[PDB]
Amino acid sequence: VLSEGEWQLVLHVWAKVEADVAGHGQDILIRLFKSHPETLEKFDRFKHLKTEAEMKASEDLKKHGVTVLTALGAILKKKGHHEAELKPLAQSHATKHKIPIKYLEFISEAIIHVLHSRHPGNFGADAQGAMNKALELFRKDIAAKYKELGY
């Protein structure tokens, strides 16, 4: 369970992210795809992209980065009381998109890296640890839903 202090650190940096949702979403998905190419293969929508420049030039990829970070932001602002937001996401990601929990770990790493690059003064080690805990909570709770469903 995150403390109130930990949530403050998470949401303080997240308020910075929200000044440029789409740029962050692009950097995070690109980092995910470059670092873990099996992830790109899960997107029929993106698997034609073969270079980082092609990824950066895709408006559809940028739109999807906004979709992703908008959903994550709504979850983080619930400070753990996020059951209603996570159910539909876990259901789609387990049963329709067929995303393993491990790939959620990979996107969490990409998020943390991009936040560190873009917001170092609001993303020192205390805030990195708190965000790690927030994303771990996200993963834990999705994984319990996956287990229920047999994924």
The distance of closest approach from Cβ of residue 63 to ligand HEM in the complex, given in angstroms and rounded to an integer, is 9
- Which residues in 108-147 contact ligand HEM (CB under 6 A)? none
93 is in an annotated binding site: yes
Is residue 43 within the footprint of ligand HEM (CB under 6 A)? yes
- Put residue 43 in one of left, alpha, beta given phi > 0 → left and psi -120 to 50 → alpha: beta
Burial class (CB in 10 A: 0-12, 13-18, 19+), 127: buried
CA dihedral 27, 29, 30, 36 (to 10 degrees): 140
Binding flags for ligand HEM, 52-91, as an x/- string (CB under 6 A): ---------------xx--xx----------------x--
The conformation of residue 97, written as its DSSP 8-state character, comes to: S
Whole-number Å distance between alpha carbons of 137 and 83: 12
Of 59 and 121, nearer to ligand HEM (C-beta) is 59
Contact footprint for ligand HEM (CB under 6 A)? 39, 42-43, 45, 67-68, 71-72, 89, 92-93, 97, 99, 103-104, 107
Q: Known binding site for nitrite: residues?
A: 64
Q: Known binding site for heme b: residues?
A: 93
